[PDB]
Amino acid sequence: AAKDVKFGNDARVKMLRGVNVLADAVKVTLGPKGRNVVLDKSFGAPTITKDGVSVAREIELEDKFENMGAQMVKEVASKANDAAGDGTTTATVLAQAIITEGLKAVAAGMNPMDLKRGIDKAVTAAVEELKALSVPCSDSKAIAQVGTISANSDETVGKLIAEAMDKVGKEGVITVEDGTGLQDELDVVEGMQFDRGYLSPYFINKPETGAVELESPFILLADKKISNIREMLPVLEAVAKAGKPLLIIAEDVEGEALATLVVNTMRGIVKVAAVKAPGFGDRRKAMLQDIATLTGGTVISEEIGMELEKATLEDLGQAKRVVINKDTTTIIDGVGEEAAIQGRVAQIRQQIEEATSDYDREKLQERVAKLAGGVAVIKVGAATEVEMKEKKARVEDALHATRAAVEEGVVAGGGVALIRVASKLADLRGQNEDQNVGIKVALRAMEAPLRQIVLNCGEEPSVVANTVKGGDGNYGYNAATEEYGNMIDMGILDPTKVTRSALQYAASVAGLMITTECMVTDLP
Amino acid sequence: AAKDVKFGNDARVKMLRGVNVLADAVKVTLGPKGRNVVLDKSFGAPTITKDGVSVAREIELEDKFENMGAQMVKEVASKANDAAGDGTTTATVLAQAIITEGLKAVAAGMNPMDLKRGIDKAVTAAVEELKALSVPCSDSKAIAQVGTISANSDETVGKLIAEAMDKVGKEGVITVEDGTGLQDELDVVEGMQFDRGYLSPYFINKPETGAVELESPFILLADKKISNIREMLPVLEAVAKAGKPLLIIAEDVEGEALATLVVNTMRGIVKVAAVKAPGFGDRRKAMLQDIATLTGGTVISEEIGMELEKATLEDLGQAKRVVINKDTTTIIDGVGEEAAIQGRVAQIRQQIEEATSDYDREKLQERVAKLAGGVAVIKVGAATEVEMKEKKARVEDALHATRAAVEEGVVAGGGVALIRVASKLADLRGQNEDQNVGIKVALRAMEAPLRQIVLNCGEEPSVVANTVKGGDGNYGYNAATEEYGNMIDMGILDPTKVTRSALQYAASVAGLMITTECMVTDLP
Amino acid sequence: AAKDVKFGNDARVKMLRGVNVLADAVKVTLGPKGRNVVLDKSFGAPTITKDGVSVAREIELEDKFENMGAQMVKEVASKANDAAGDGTTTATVLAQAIITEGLKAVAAGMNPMDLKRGIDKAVTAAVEELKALSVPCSDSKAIAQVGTISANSDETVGKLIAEAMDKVGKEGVITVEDGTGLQDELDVVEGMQFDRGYLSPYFINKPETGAVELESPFILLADKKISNIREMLPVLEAVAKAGKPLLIIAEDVEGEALATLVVNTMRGIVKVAAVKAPGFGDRRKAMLQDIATLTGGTVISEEIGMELEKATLEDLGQAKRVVINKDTTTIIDGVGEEAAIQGRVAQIRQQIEEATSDYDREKLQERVAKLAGGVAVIKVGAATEVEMKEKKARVEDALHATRAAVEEGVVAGGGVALIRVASKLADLRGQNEDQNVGIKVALRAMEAPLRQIVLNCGEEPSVVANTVKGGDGNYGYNAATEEYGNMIDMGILDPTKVTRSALQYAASVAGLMITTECMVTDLP
């Protein structure tokens, strides 16, 4: 309704103070000597986190102007997280430095939009230099290293991730869940396994109790429910009874089919089992074809001139063995030739890139893996729930970080990257003096991350930053050992993707934020 | 509703202060060295914008009177927007100037209604002088220029629009959507293509690309959803003997029909495909006749005496090719008479002037494009959502502005146009001395845009206004380069329509506003 | 609720101050040098108006008593508007004057009830003197003049109204709507105009812009809906297939009834069209016979001993041409006897009385115009919405004023009429001295309008009032030219009816208001 407006430097100060609250809150978590922030939650017990964007998201201020500022820089940490998954704190520190020096330049009466232009040019150039310094991260050693770094110097996490990426490969899927016991644990499921259980509990064939085993069985795949009665199916069972046991996959299996199926499996004339198909309906309908081509069987598609009632023993798929429990169904191997199969693993790759980003990629690469690779799950150990949350957060951080490292390569850590490219951009100049100042502002702000890392140790940022600028190559400061040295040799690695993204995102919002000559909001 | 009344100068001052708050808020965005305003939003993050009407709309003041003033002048920016789409800020600045100088004139005790009379006369003359100064904007260079100017000196956007307008021809449509990646992108679809997919994936001919290609097919156009194949059948048998494929368009095609159709296209009995009609009921039924006349077939209307069972090969439409994928359908080289096409486009032009703006103009011209011209979409690149808002806003501004240039021609930018016609009206006089004063108020106020453009650079407006008024023709001040020169030669162009509009709209509300002797509102 | 009572002068002051607030608010709009009032509105933008009653209606005051006063005198402006349509401001000023001098007289201890009697007697006499002074207003010159005057010296309005009233005659109907473009436009539809559109768009004939033309067709008139009446129809269809096209008018034509009609106009058996009947159920059936006698056709009433299926080729009416679009239908040159036309015109004349003056007259005069004469519509041009409200208000004012003048004639403007009758009543006396004082109060108050018109110019009202009171006849003051002269020759004319009304209503509420010895209201 009724508004309140402020103009010029008067508004810039309020906005800046607002930025500074969010930034000062996020800064303490930066680097190895960084400390932890506690975020209250109304419903439960509090959460303790070193994760930057988690802290940033929770910040909101009275005094609506300061709040506007904070709400604006919150976006840099949020997009940093949503793109890379690590380095949010760094992106925030960069944003703060840029806003500060930038507004300082505006106070000098320099043209703000021109400052923005200079900054953005400086950033594009710096991004080129970054993409240049990057060296591929391939061998499991380096991977374990960047893993350890994103995890705040927990070696176990890095080595565990290196192992997982080693077993299921890069293309393979890796997920992380809460662990029961205190030790971190890595579970790896190979081959075709999907998450659904047996419809009838009577099917257990083994002293394994819940589990069910079928040796070299035949697999039947149906698009439609058997939900009516057992009428249509038995013609297939008659051919299936000749030499083999049988596995069923469909939409669902109702009583009339199930009970009779049970009675026949009990004596049993032939051993049979039935489970729901893996996913939600359409995706799952797509996954039935996966199971089909994998087992060398054919899907029965109601919407074609193949009828559910008529099917022959050759229509069935074959497998070495199959195992079912309350949770998942498993095929121990496909009997179909790898030419056609790998044809389908390759052809699904055209489906891999799409407007759905990672939503499709998790379960699609899941699909690809289940056919070719494997799926992995990391159970994070902790004593208490408050340790559990933070620990798992660092783990997911390390996972994102390693994926980024693998994808875009890595550059020297400890914030030595940005300062190193900044030294290469010293001769860069713009169209006018204002733009020159903008560039110089950006180049100054790229020192921020390192100075903050040093500062969290309670040491001179000026001195360390200088003695680093005195050096060449990967020479940098090791904050944990509080000594200088070669970063790459010390195994301190920043994934290029996260440094690149953090810088890009910081400059994007700070650039716009320093062009503010007016602010409009609701009344207090 | 207990009221509160104020009279005369006592009330005029409150009104003026409010106006001054709205205007001073909008002004900072004026011109190239103009700056940005931040608008808080309850639901989301704040918005950063250089767009004038965007800032104007958000303004509301506590004091009911001041608020009445602001709420009244907000309309000039709004109408500016609804007519031109650019020049909102300018229209606001003109309104502020006229109001200020006018109320001062009332302080002299002059007759307000006569001041309005004088102002309106001066404006009426100035518009003609503008129509004289306006020169055609045709070549892609000029278009690119006005684009660049309205876009706040982003040349890329200016070139993009000129290019697009070149590719889709006149009557072709150009729209802008949020872009996925950081770079700007121009997409162009030529001819008749609508967004619907094949109903069954089994229809696919010539895979991969999951596309269906029909060479010289028959197009079937149905107003109703297709459930049974009985009603469907005769025409299909007629086409199978015909030697040709068949394309289907309806509200939808239900199971029995799809299934029968799929099985028949599979057996290799007939090559067929089916897609939904393009829009919602009135929209789709309206577009069915377009597609019909384009392909020379006749729509089967249950609501007329054609029933689907009775259908003829002549009821069918024909085309050179049709191509369908999961997303879009395309009709290539329809066989419908060029006569019929220009007939229906002409018949749509009567719908073009329809009193309901925005989407009606947008989606109607869209249809036109599909029949004759082509459609284009400009995707705006940005790192973050706030940058996306700023860039995309500037893009639609540049878009409307270029369209305005094409329609009404262009005049010298930098507001040098208004001052130039104002010098031409210097000998104008009215019926009495007061009206004479009104004219002078208008002519003095036409300097405002230029003086503000200069003022936002932090330079003497007085001096620039003088040295410009000393000159003639298109000689003006370049605010970006902060040096003088010919406006047209330096490519600073104001679309004549937005400049003409800004002035008329400003004058209409301000003229009335200075006639206020009393103000009535609710009590605090 | 708990009340609050005040007695005598203490309460009278409270009433008076409120009256004075309403009045001082309305007065500022009086005469040519009058000014404008701004009225806040919660939902939308504020409203700017010179219209008196509009300002009056919006007034309500905190203090309950002052509010009682204002709320009571608001009724004079309201009744003035509801009767005349102009002269609201004048009526208000009269009321304030009368109330003021009256309360003054009450302070002298005069019997209020006697004062009321004196006032009313003086007024009743003053009306006679007015109708004596009244001169016929006929010629388009005069019409244009009083029109222009009520419109606040906008000549275009006077000319437009004169054009319409000359074109459509007096009895003809005139309405006013918001205009598309900036310029005022007068549209005139001669002959039989019909408000409803075609039910099927396929009926379209040779014209474009979706119009249908039938040359020398037959007219069909039905009381009942045609749906299942499809089969009833053909007996008539035989003549339509024989020699000529066909037109249908009824309650409605449902689906499948319509379709058959369309198909035949397509195949080319018969050219036909169908539209809904004009009005709501009972009103409309009366207008059907009008159309019947106009075209020489006969109404078919299912609700009479006219049967639906059987009708003859001669039972139909004939016309030169008919034209239909989405909005309106038009019948050219009915073949019905002038005997029948003037017969229905004459038989409606007892109905022009219509047992009331208000609701019915509006749409009845519409019917009257449509049958013999013609209808006119004035579209009002404006740049912006706030101007549109103001312009159309003055236009509607001028329209009412012209009709009033034509019916009752005109008298000299500038409020010189009343001051002229006041001189004639100088010898008037009552029953006792108090009543005499009342008479003199009315006569004294009749000077008020002129003195206010003068006062809004910032001139001595006393001086102009005296030097005007010194002359005779139509001698008066022109406030726009600010010099004296003959009023009617200068084209300043007040319709006798509005002055007569203003005086009567003002006297009615003011006479009673001064009789107050006590006031009761709710507590704060």
Ligand SMILES: Nc1ncnc2c1ncn2[C@@H]1O[C@H](COP(=O)(O)OP(=O)(O)O)[C@@H](O)[C@H]1O
């Ligand atoms: N032992 C270390 N010595 C020097 N720099 C380190 C060390 N460990 C991590 N860093 C640097 O600190 C940064 C880690 O920041 P962190 O606190 O994880 O928040 P974020 O990852 O969101 O920036 C990385 O850029 C990394 O290069």
Ligand SMILES: Nc1ncnc2c1ncn2[C@@H]1O[C@H](COP(=O)(O)OP(=O)(O)O)[C@@H](O)[C@H]1O
């Ligand atoms: N470099 C420049 N030098 C001088 N005038 C300019 C320059 N760029 C734009 N202008 C003028 O400034 C005005 C820009 O309007 P803008 O500030 O974008 O808001 P709006 O278009 O809503 O008024 C136009 O008159 C344009 O001609």
Ligand SMILES: Nc1ncnc2c1ncn2[C@@H]1O[C@H](COP(=O)(O)OP(=O)(O)O)[C@@H](O)[C@H]1O
């Ligand atoms: N040029 C003029 N000189 C003097 N009086 C005028 C002039 N024009 C109009 N008037 C008077 O002004 C009065 C009407 O003005 P206005 O207040 O706008 O409407 P109303 O009072 O009828 O509601 C009429 O009595 C008319 O005679």
Ligand code: BEF
């Ligand atoms: F504080 Be982090 F590693 F996003």
Ligand code: BEF
């Ligand atoms: F200030 Be704008 F580009 F309408």
Ligand code: BEF
């Ligand atoms: F106050 Be008005 F011109 F009816």
Ligand SMILES: [K+]
């Ligand atoms: K961290």
Ligand SMILES: [K+]
């Ligand atoms: K702008």
Ligand SMILES: [K+]
């Ligand atoms: K008035």
Ligand SMILES: [Mg+2]
């Ligand atoms: Mg990290």
Ligand SMILES: [Mg+2]
């Ligand atoms: Mg602009």
Ligand SMILES: [Mg+2]
């Ligand atoms: Mg009037």
